[PDB]
């Protein structure tokens, strides 16, 4: 058995003869239970490490397998080998050392013991010293899965039966490792990344032949695999996209159907994707993490002195330990880069990303014909029936894939033709919202696709422009859905300004290189006015205060910062705040800067009675702030850190203004708006503008100082108009307001008057009466004419002397 | 006769049934054996649903053959 | 236009008739930061203390509550250690037609009774509704260790 | 009816919920999911810490809400 | 004594009252058809609360005076 192992070069060909001489007796099965549990104590005993390292070993492993499957009759009884299929009480990290099929599906150049063997010599070596040892190893690797392909893809046509038992045996891995998507899993209790990235590699390969550019063999795969319940896949838990847990009860129930391996085999390689590399790479994205808290722990004890002699064997331990954990973890880290990096392993994936989001799509299409014809664009209710009982993990696996995959320059999302696909789904979920009643998986669809129009270091267009130019079905409904998205995510709240920065992106990106949807907006903002004057107020809304919250932030880290001048829960505040001031300042500048722009072109869109009163006060706010001493006195530490750049703010912030400076009722607004107004504020801002030198133009100012004039005359004027009113009777005063009423009508609740405005800005909140309580609507209302009548007459009566 | 019972985690379990047995009594079998609840309880043969009412006879079950039982997706 | 005048008006009304154990005003020139102070109920642990207010009126004051939080660290279970304050009338049940004078008598109505099921503290909660000599106790040490 | 729960590092988690259920049955149910003992799950909603005794009954019934998860570590340097 | 008391939504309820009873005797006869907690006994009248700890003979209700029970949203 050893020998046979050391030499299996030269038993190739006598051991081939004893294996045929069973095959005719009818007692290969004996053999077979004889040697692979031999093999497997062999790998585990007499070898402590069976792994990538020694590459005698494991290469006569595979070669022992490669002559084992080739035969037919041997390959379609070879699931009956004692110890095949794990225990119904086996531990989930327990699968790769029990099982015939366990170790050699574990071989993998990210193991600890080959990231110590190839990178814990040098921990600095450069960027070329570093592709190197990654290709060194990335060939082996595709040579040891290209061999497992070969291996399973014999047992998967050896017959009928095994083709079961390997779903079978690849569903109860997948069911023992739903801990792997936790936020700190047992690592130590759960499947290694090495063991299941091959698996999830083998069925994706298993997925080229009927996902074709053709997409002729999409039709191989069941849409109708969800209405029957899974016999393989434990949907137990596992949350559906628009249907709760009684509504699919129900509908399994409703409707009362034989499995096809097909559709067995398309559903399991999107759950490896989820709970598979989905996993890893969120092991691997807190690995920039973990070491910094490390090198911290490290870094206190090695200024402690050690006398003691019980206590300084412990300490210079304590160090040993750790220097090997984070020998392991540096190691680690360094492999599952340049493991993600190996685009041969990588355009596969993506590419079966692609052709799943075209297998969606064709479900979702009424006629299931998208692959061929296009498709033509209370939510729960009217959601597709065969869409909203799938569950949530076939868009939560891909989308988490290419969030975490686009990192890197090496990426196989760019210049992949096969890429539209995905984008396609992507605009179908963002139109209709009946196809998901979750928003927070949209907000991370919608930061995928702000990652994807994310311009480049050399300024070119993203690798996703094209798509958004040359593609049929997006360019007709991309802006609406965003437009959209943007007000619904208002459903403390801490994250919904993170979408809105990721919708600031793709709308600003949209409106500068699309000139198509740059029609497209003012055709909205001219035939659909409803529609987007609802986003501009939602964008208008939130402005107001998101200085407020990065000054309080910015001032906060400060007060923390001091503190330490002087435990870690002050530390962890302070991040948490610096990550807050840092969503403020960027949602801020963009939508100062999307303001801009859009009142570049529409400013007729900014001068409804509905937006102006708000819009002023806005701008004056904001503007004080920037020109008064609270933003001037914040001196924070490396400011392009943050992006808190008043400066460049200012600029936008005074093009506003410029931009609706050709309109009476903006400039009238601005003069109205006592609150936050005063014509020292732009003579301040222009000697702001005249530090940057070349930021602002000579004109710009002038225009910005003509501006100013031509209010500071307005509100000269209201003042004139206001001091030739002084005592007034208490009775021509709103209750509410304390100013005299334009449209006096009188309340059916509590009998007393109010201005039209007024209770229509109350009710705008809620329908109850202000002074008692009761139910109110604009309906309930009454002119009050006569009021009104000794309202002119008062008023022309302080005309008799003005 | 014995039959063979799998379950959505990988339980094989073994149970004397006879023919004209109703299937609420193989769910109550089956309760007796591991305490789960007939109404919880849902059983699959040659991938079909089955029905309370129904024998085995009349779905033609034949001996030391393999269900599958599926755990009717427990609310929270 | 929308909320000057109003602030103004509350200011004369209360400029007209102080309250007894209350004081409130603007901080400086600003219109839009007050400072209120107040003075404990006599059938309190918390008489014989002054404590300041943090007023941030929004721009929307008539049509929404303001924004005042506690400046002197009182012991106190519906208070926080940001000042914050657990109270009713600054929430949905807020009405236009009510004054920031009737707002600080709430304060004080707030201080006299301690209303316990709104566990703002969880700790200083689970203190009163077991043993009040602790509470009654430790809320006038930290009077004096503040509130002087 | 279902609620939202949302953590610190990015992931949302949906979980069906009763009025009558009580909180710690929420934590019980989320420490399947997710590998944390109740004791360490702390949960923000409106700024207010909840209560083990309470129930989902109490805080602002609504359906699709969205709690938060503080994360409270057993050992501190 | 026959009194009176209004939702937010207009439904009104109609039932007996004495002059020696409490806001909560008078809460008592609210979960008899709603089935309300009396922690959220919330009386809105003129303005002003109806605090619940005390009795009848302090909030001035007289015959077929209509109060105002509006459900309590507390906590924060």
Not at chain 1, 62 to 75: H, M, N, R, S
Not at chain 1, 252 to 267: A, L, Q, T, V
Not at chain 1, 566 to 572: F, P, S
Request: aromatic share 10%.
């Amino acid at each position: 058995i050893t020998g046979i192992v050391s030499n299996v070069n030269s038993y190739t060909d006598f051991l081939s003869q004893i294996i045929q001489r069973a095959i005719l007796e009818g007692t290969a099965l004996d053999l077979l239970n004889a040697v692979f549990p031999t093999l497997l104590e062999y790998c585990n005993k007499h070898v402590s490490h069976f792994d990538l390292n020694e590459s005698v070993i494991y290469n006569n492993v595979l070669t022992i397998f490669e002559l084992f499957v080739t035969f037919k009759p041997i390959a379609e009884i070879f699931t009956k080998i004692d110890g095949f299929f794990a225990d119904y009480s086996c531990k989930p990290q327990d699968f790769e050392r029990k099982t015939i099929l366990g170790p050699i599906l574990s071989l993998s150049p990210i193991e600890a013991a080959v990231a110590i063997r190839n990178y814990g010599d040098n921990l600095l070596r450069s960027k070329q010293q570093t592709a190197m040892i990654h290709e060194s190893l990335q060939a082996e690797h595709k040579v040891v899965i290209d061999r497992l392909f070969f291996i399973v893809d014999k047992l998967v046509r050896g017959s009928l039966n095994s083709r079961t038992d390997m779903i079978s045996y690849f569903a109860h891995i997948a069911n023992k490792n739903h801990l792997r998507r936790a936020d700190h899993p047992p690592f130590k209790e759960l499947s290694s990344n090495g063991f299941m990235s091959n698996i999830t590699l083998l069925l994706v390969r298993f997925s080229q032949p009927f996902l074709d550019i053709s997409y002729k063999k999409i039709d191989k795969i069941d849409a109708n695999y969800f209405n029957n319940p899974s016999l393989f896949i434990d949907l137990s838990g596992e949350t559906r996209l628009n249907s709760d847990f009684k509504e699919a009860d129900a509908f399994y129930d409703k409707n009362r159907s034989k499995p096809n391996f097909i559709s067995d085999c398309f559903f399991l390689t999107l759950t490896y994707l989820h709970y598979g590399l989905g996993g890893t790479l969120s092991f691997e994205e807190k690995m920039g993490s973990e070491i910094k808290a490390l090198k911290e722990e490290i870094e206190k004890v090695k200024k402690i002195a050690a006398n003691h002699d019980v206590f300084a064997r412990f300490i210079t331990a304590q160090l040993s330990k750790m220097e090997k954990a984070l020998k392991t973890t540096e190691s680690l880290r360094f492999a599952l880069q340049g493991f993600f990096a190996h685009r041969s392993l990588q355009l596969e994936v993506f590419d079966f990303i692609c052709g799943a989001s075209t297998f969606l799509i064709r479900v979702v299409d009424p006629e299931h014909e998208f692959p061929f014809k296009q498709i033509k664009l209370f939510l729960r209710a009217h959601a597709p029936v065969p869409f909203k009982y799938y569950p949530e993990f076939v868009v939560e696996g891909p989308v988490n894939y290419s969030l975490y995959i686009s990192k890197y320059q090496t990426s196989p999302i760019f210049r992949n033709p096969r890429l539209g696909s995905f984008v396609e789904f992507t605009t179908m979920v963002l139109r209709c919202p009946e196809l998901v009643s979750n928003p927070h998986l949209k907000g991370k669809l919608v930061q995928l696709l702000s990652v994807g129009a994310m311009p480049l270091t050399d300024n070119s267009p993203g690798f996703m422009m094209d798509i958004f130019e040359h593609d049929e079905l997006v360019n007709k409904n991309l802006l609406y859905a965003l437009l959209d998205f943007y007000v619904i995510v208002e459903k403390q709240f801490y994250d919904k300004f993170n979408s809105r920065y990721s919708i600031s992106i793709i709308l600003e990106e949209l409106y500068y290189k699309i000139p198509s949807y740059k029609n497209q907006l003012i055709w909205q903002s001219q035939n659909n006015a409803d529609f987007f004057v609802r986003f501009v107020a939602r964008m208008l809304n939130d402005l107001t205060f998101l200085l407020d919250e990065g000054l309080s932030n910015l001032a906060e880290v400060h007060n923390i910062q001091n503190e330490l001048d002087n435990d870690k829960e002050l530390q962890t505040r302070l991040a948490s705040a610096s990550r807050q001031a840092k969503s403020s300042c960027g949602l801020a500048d963009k939508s100062m800067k999307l303001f801009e722009i859009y009142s570049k072109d529409i400013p007729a869109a900014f001068v409804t009675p509905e937006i102006v009163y708000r819009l002023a006060s806005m701008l004056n706010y904001n503007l004080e702030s920037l020109v008064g001493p609270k933003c001037g006195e914040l001196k924070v530490k490396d400011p392009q850190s943050y992006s808190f750049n008043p400066k460049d703010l200012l600029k936008a912030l005074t093009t506003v203004y410029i931009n609706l400076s050709e309109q009476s009722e903006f400039i009238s607004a601005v003069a109205k708006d006592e609150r936050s107004f005063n014509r020292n504020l732009f003579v301040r801002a222009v000697d702001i503008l005249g530090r940057k030198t070349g930021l602002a133009s000579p004109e710009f100012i002038e225009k910005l100082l003509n501006f100013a004039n031509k209010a500071e005359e307005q509100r000269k004027a209201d003042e004139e108009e206001d001091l030739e009113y002084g005592d007034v009777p208490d009775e021509f005063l709103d209750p509410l307001m304390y100013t005299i009423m334009k449209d006096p009508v009188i309340l059916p609740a509590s009998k007393m008057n109010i201005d039209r405005s007024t209770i229509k800005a109350h009710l705008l909140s809620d329908s109850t009466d202000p002074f008692n309580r009761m139910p109110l609507k604009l309906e309930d209302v009454t002119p009050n004419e006569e009021l009104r009548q000794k309202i002119l007459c008062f008023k022309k009566q302080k005309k008799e002397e003005a | 006769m014995q039959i063979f019972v799998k379950t959505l985690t990988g339980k094989t379990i073994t149970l004397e049934v006879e023919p004209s047995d109703t299937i609420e009594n193989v769910k109550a079998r089956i309760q007796d054996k591991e305490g789960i609840p007939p109404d919880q309880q849902r059983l699959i043969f040659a991938g079909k649903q089955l029905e309370d009412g129904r024998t085995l006879s009349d779905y033609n079950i034949q001996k030391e053959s393999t269900l599958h039982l599926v755990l009717r997706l427990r609310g929270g | 236009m929308s909320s000057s005048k109003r602030i103004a008006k509350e200011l004369s009304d209360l400029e007209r008739d102080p309250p007894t154990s209350s004081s409130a005003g603007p901080v400086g020139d600003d219109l839009y930061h007050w400072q209120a102070s107040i003075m404990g109920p006599a059938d309190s642990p918390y008489a014989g203390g002054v404590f300041f207010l943090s007023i941030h009126f929004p721009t929307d004051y008539p049509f929404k509550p303001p924004k005042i939080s506690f400046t002197t660290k009182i012991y106190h279970p519906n208070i926080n250690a940001n000042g914050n304050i657990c109270l009713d009338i600054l929430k949905d049940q807020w009405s236009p037609a009510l004054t920031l004078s009737k707002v600080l008598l709430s304060i004080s109505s707030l201080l006299t009774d301690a209303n316990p099921d709104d566990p703002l503290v969880p700790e200083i909660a689970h203190i009163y509704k077991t043993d009040r000599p602790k509470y009654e106790a430790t809320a006038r040490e930290w009077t004096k260790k503040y509130a002087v």
